[PDB]
Design a protein around this ligand. Structure first.
Ligand SMILES: Nc1ncnc2c1ncn2[C@@H]1O[C@H](COP(=O)(O)OP(=O)(O)O)[C@@H](O)[C@H]1O
Ligand SMILES: [Mg+2]
Ligand SMILES: [Mg+2]
Lengths: 312, 50, 312, 312, 312, 313, 309, 48
DNA sequence: CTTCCTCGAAGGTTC
DNA sequence: GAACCTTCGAGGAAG
């Protein structure tokens, strides 16, 4: 299937994957529940996929929900106490839970009980509701939004990193086997180098090249077809989009490389300041084409040799 | 028919249907016009003070 | 009617049309729904119009709603429950939705299911709604306000561009036919050069000139009639308005072309600092009348010859 | 009635009248509704009265409301259901309509349809409504405070200017003719100059002068009687109000002539910022009593000699 | 007298009192009702007493209500229907009635009738009610907080102002007669100077001085006794309250005259920051003891000599 | 004494105490009740006890209630009928009374009657209920939210103030006797100086010092025990806790006196924004050690000299 | 068990622990209940644990509830109605109670009676002598009237290296794992001063020794396990080290803004400001300045670069 | 005497008491001959 | 009641 | 000393 199911199939993330293997194997030897795990990092790196792999390796059934669907203490109190011994509870977007609900987890995670008011009027009473052993798993992109007392209770932490070209090539070839398409190893590398390091983008490029090859070609992804399709999409061999190329060119041909301010540059390309700072500048900086300084943006030597100008 | 139009106007002024019905039903004058009914149902409900 | 119904009618946007044709034809051969698509760019360029064409080409019923019309998760779930296999859902001004709603689409777009809490509260449980195949289409004026995880899920992106005079001239002609008027080709080009490259503006100017020619003339838009109407509407032959002209005049009469600071210039024209910077300065720069420099903005020779002064 | 009802009665605003006449006449050879029109300018210049003239020239019914009177987006939909074909809707103070409500008009103006949510809870469903042909007339003081999506959809723009001495004098003679009053040509000229170039003020003054001349005189308004009556009221020799005197006095005595910002002045004079910015500054500037600078406003020498201070 | 029936009995407000006399008698000569009048100014100056005098001079019964006492159109229509030709309706705090009432108030004031549309969908009717002639008199604290379109419906404005020392001393003398207390012209003038312009403040001090003279003195309010009593009450010779003195003393002794922010100052003295800016600073600024600046409040040189401190 | 009966026994508040003495005596010389009184000041200074002493001087009974506890007009009228001639009614937190009740109090205060109106149209009638002369005593803490119609009826205004070393010290001595603890006069002064002018704080300090003196000492509070007891606790001779000293030290050592933002200061001392801004910062301003500015907090010259640092502009 | 039960077992907190002994011993001598106590401070320092110890030293039965569990005054009345003479009521996360409930509680604390309205009817109670114990992280969120009723205030602090070393040795014996003295100090230096973090590292190291070792912790396995977690000898994580490296090599030590730094490491702005910087500022590796943040001389020494003023 | 019995309840209703409760409150008073003022006074006093 | 966001100040560089 | 650019801090209003 499109999502891997076992560590055999999960490519990359060697640091995270190695740690989880050791902790999961030790937990089985003691015959006890796995500690609480928190998975966090950039978008599209495999956080949701890993949570399903953990449940398969432990050999237990997974219960799933999300932070937005939970809104009041009665909701979580009803989800809890439905757990059987050894269940795994996975909450996606755990950062959306209201802070009044987060504080109910403080007792549940540390001591496996929650205080509940039961009865009404004179019959109202406070009694311990005692939970069976279980493992909570959360996934989030905004870990800094969780309360400090909660993050302190997670016993395992996983920070997801970007993938390298060798691993991305193997993912493209794997996906090219679910779809019934022949792909040459040259084209598999030609795509991976443009995927910005993210598996979700690699899958998106493959689907777009497929549509072209089966309409404008013979339905085979060869080197000749791939170059034509990537020219239609106008994606450079470094993953720079059409607008990205225009930004670097405007900086070198009008300001001689800078320094130039964000406002002045945006107006010259007819783009609003927000789209430039949020969609395009972040990748150019991480790859070293632009440098931010107190006086403005500056084009680096690497940008000159990429666009073909002279670094005078 | 003037009863319905009278209540509708009182309803248009924001009075509840139960009170509007009682207010108009308390008044009775076959020769009254829809305007003259409204001017009497309200005059009977305001607490006049001197 | 004014809005084109098919790609054969739609003029311009060659880059967007070429890509959409290939993807729509490939989807039909496989007998599948189209991938999610995001349309973005400046106002009045044709974003809404294109969405209807896509529905006509796929041959399916287009369901419509808007960002500010959706206020809570229950509203979206109601809209999504009404979907049928292959329907197209169009959400205009998608950047206006609240974040607590946008995070519900994350599962709907990737796995076609939604987590919901149901029941009065005494008894309740989480359940999965399973959605049929569907295609989401979004339109926005500012893609920078969308979260990174949402943009990553759109499989097709269409950036709209301004129109060139040849393409904008043909649009003026077509619109004259629907009004049953006759227009000389010289007049159609005059209107285009004053429309700032936007089809919406071109239609408005034509509608006003049409009224004038049929009231004080022989019902024909000739080059001489157009000049009279456009002089009464106070639109220069460069598409500048009176406020724009007042700015250029002040920069030459009081500062000899600058450099001058924005605050200093604003005072001499009784214009608000940000109004000038956000409303008028952008077009003057893109046309090349004004130029920004480290010590202030400067009027180019093109601005001198247009005003009739002597350059130095 | 005091309010004019036809263009043959409406004095002044020739630049506006000429345009509206041509557009209205064209809209009658075709059986069509007039395009949405936006009227903007200082308060009290006669834009509300103009709406009645348009409605009478079209020969259609007129319905009135105001931005603040529409409490919520649903109230607008209910109002639109009462509009008959060809009805004109006038919305005063259109710039202060709520954002959630303003975004409701966009689709109604452009395509005569609007998407709304009907029912509640499990019955909640989306619906679209289709509106009969109608013409919206909007009035606002701050022509630039409108949102670009709304502003770009109006087809006709009307900029209303102040009246000149020959025009206001004729209006005074007209008003004194509906009343059974007699006024000498010299007093009418004096009253106009004393009325800030604004018809509403000129009418209000005449009503009060009439009472004075009837009791303290022979029932006839003469220069000798008008000057006295104007001094019994608070109208100064230059038409300054009693509140204007406070502003000019404070700037010279408490700030040493300026420069001073209206923000800091407002709280020192104990007045609403909105009133000093809108009611007092526009006249004091356009008549040379106040000068605007990058640092702030400054009182001119004319203000020094008028108030009787030393022009240090 | 203390509670007058006619203008000849009312003390002070000579400017407003002189204006109303001409308008009231002129209306009788024409045999018609008086135009709508708006009274505004500081609280406690006599606005309510003035409305009764107007009704007596006209020879009309006065009806009274208040802004908060009206909640729905049915309330106003009920009162207005019970009016008799020429009756006066007084509404206190006309600026605070609900906005849904003002829509009805317009037609009542301008047309003297109301139109109540009824029916929906395929049905549309209205009932039209006619009302007798009447005069509306409204009172407010500020003229700018009133609704802009409503403010245009009033034809007469009355600006009340603080009382002078000769008028205050007259009031003090009259009040002493009610309590059977003998007060000399010297003491009467002292209580006036220190009452800062408001009659009910002068009445409070008189009552307190009686209790002192009856025990600490010989029952006669001499100048020597009056001056002693006021120091026991801690009232400065400039009329600074106990709290007013605390503010100035703190700025000089703890902050070297400032500048100091409102948040800092209001926390040093046990007071609410919203209270200091509303009840105490206004009088201190009008008397020139405090002056506002970008850095905060500053104590002027006058305050230094008043409090008895060596100025810089 | 702790349960005072007359102004002679009430500790402190000499300014308000001397003013009330005259108004009370002048009222007794006539067949009239005391004018309506309104007491202002920070919370926790003894306003409740002051009302009781006023009633004893007048020689009348005192009824007590509060604004939050009243909810309908009938509640107020029911209490007003229980009043005997000259009785005093004390309403605490009077600024929270619901408007529905406030509109009925105006007529009672001014004329001593209420005029209940009933019926409609031709059935419109009223009933007049006479009320016995009474004095209303109101107590508030947010004077700026009383309506002008209500404030106009209150004739006497009284301002409460923090106690001072010559009169705060006497409270400590009298409290020491309630639990039979002998305290030296020179030691009571050292406790009073650290009580921030609040009796609740002085009582709390004495309780803790007592526990120390009977476990680590001979059951006597001498100057030596006070020195040790006030050293185990962090309280400085100016009344600054351990955290207060750390805030001033951090601003002077690391930021040169500021300006420094609340967020940047919070992370240095490891405290929440709400804890520094509401627990510690308020007393430092009242003492004059810091000021708040548009760019952040700044330490004054008074703080430098108190903490022992050379101040340079 | 993991939670100590008596002061003889409670390692550290000498200031708070010393004071409570004096106050607890004096109360017993007078046969009176202990004064109301408030415990507050950073997360994981031992606040909850101390509440159970106080109850055992007093020899009383502890009643327990939490702030989030109490929604209306009717709930609190039912709880208080169960108190017996000398009983202790412990309310955790006390800052969450609604303001309508706090107004009731501070009256009961001073006068030991309740007179409240709760179809509405008055309820009256006369409570026996009792002690309320509160624990909270957001002490400043409580109203000033409530804080004035508490008679004892315990403010917690971070632990020293010798104390944490003894805590690691105690936990190791509960797991029946053998650990050498020189290896326990290695876990202490990395625990940021917090007992909960120390216990977490021991559990993670234990799992490694059972799979890659012989079930024994020694000064060789610890180095290997700590290299797998990538925790520096100062307690810096991988991302903490990346922040210092970027500032020193790309900005010459600063000043640099929060926005510029976040985009360079591909982190979210709020994650750096709330999760990583707080520890670096307290250790003295970074300082905030009016124009940005700069790396101090201590950072250069730790990363191994030439410092230049 | 029925007029006062009704009056006492009606005035008590304007004071915020419920129609049922006002009827009961007045019903608890025995003397019918006394005026509505005497009834409302006793009715209020009994509810304290 | 809480989070977000926008308005304002000022340090530093360069002409 | 006028003009740009980047950075931090305190309010407040929109759910
Ligand atoms: N000109 C005046 N002559 C006599 N008494 C006055 C005068 N102005 C105010 N007062 C007295 O001061 C108080 C003013 O009350 P009121 O007129 O209701 O104030 P306002 O209506 O201005 O708030 C009354 O006690 C009134 O008798
Ligand atoms: Mg996911
Ligand atoms: Mg805890």
């Amino acid at each position: 299937t499109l999502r891997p199911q076992y560590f055999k199939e999960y490519i990359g993330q060697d640091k995270v994957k190695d740690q989880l293997k050791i902790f999961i194997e030790a937990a089985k030897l003691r015959d006890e529940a796995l500690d609480h795990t928190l998975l966090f990092g950039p978008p599209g790196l495999g956080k949701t996929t890993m949570a399903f792999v953990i449940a398969n390796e432990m050999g237990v059934n997974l219960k799933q929900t999300s932070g937005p669907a939970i809104e009041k203490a009665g909701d979580l109190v009803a989800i809890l106490n439905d757990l059987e011994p050894g269940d795994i509870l996975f909450i996606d977007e755990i950062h959306r839970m209201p802070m009044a609900v987060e504080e109910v987890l403080y007792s549940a995670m540390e001591d496996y009980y929650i205080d509940i008011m039961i009865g009404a009027g004179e019959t109202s009473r406070s009694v311990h509701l005692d939970l069976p052993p279980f493992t909570l798993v959360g996934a989030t992109t905004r870990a800094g939004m969780l309360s400090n007392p909660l993050r302190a209770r997670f016993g395992i932490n996983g920070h997801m990193e970007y993938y390298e070209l060798p691993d991305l090539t193997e993912i493209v070839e794997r996906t090219s086997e679910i779809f019934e398409m022949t792909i040459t190893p040259e084209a598999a590398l030609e795509l991976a180098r443009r995927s910005r390091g993210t598996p979700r983008i690699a899958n998106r490029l493959l689907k777009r090249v497929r549509d072209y090859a089966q309409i404008m070609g013979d339905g085979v992804i060869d080197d000749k077809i791939a170059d034509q399709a990537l020219t239609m999409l106008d994606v450079d061999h470094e993953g720079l989009d059409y607008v990205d190329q225009k930004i670097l060119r405007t900086m070198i041909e009008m300001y001689g490389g800078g320094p130039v301010g964000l406002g002045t540059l945006s107006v010259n390309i007819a783009e609003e300041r927000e789209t430039v700072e949020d969609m395009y500048e972040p990748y150019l900086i991480q790859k070293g084409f632009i440098m931010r300084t107190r006086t403005g943006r500056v084009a680096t030597a690497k940008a000159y040799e990429h666009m073909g100008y002279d670094y005078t | 028919d003037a009863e319905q139009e009278a209540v509708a106007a009182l309803v248009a002024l924001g009075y509840k249907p139960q009170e509007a019905s009682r207010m108009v039903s308390k008044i009775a004058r076959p020769d009254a016009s829809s305007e003259t009914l409204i001017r009497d149902a309200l005059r009977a409900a305001l607490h006049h003070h001197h």
